Amino acid sequence: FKRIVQRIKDFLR
Amino acid sequence: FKRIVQRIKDFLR
């Protein structure tokens, strides 16, 4: 789940 | 949809 959150954060930054 | 994207970004910041 940490992987999934960081991917969304990186897509939107 | 801009508002929705900003709500996700702000939740994860």
Side-chain angles (χ1 to χ4, degrees):
Chain A
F1 298 97
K2 192 169 83 82
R3 162 187 74 92
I4 294 172
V5 175
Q6 183 61 229
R7 179 165 166 169
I8 298 168
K9 285 189 53 150
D10 195 53
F11 179 55
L12 298 186
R13 75 174 177 82
Chain B
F1 290 113
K2 185 195 195 225
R3 171 183 74 84
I4 296 165
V5 170
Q6 195 45 58
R7 284 288 302 283
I8 296 167
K9 187 174 187 159
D10 186 59
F11 181 66
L12 296 183
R13 84 173 158 80

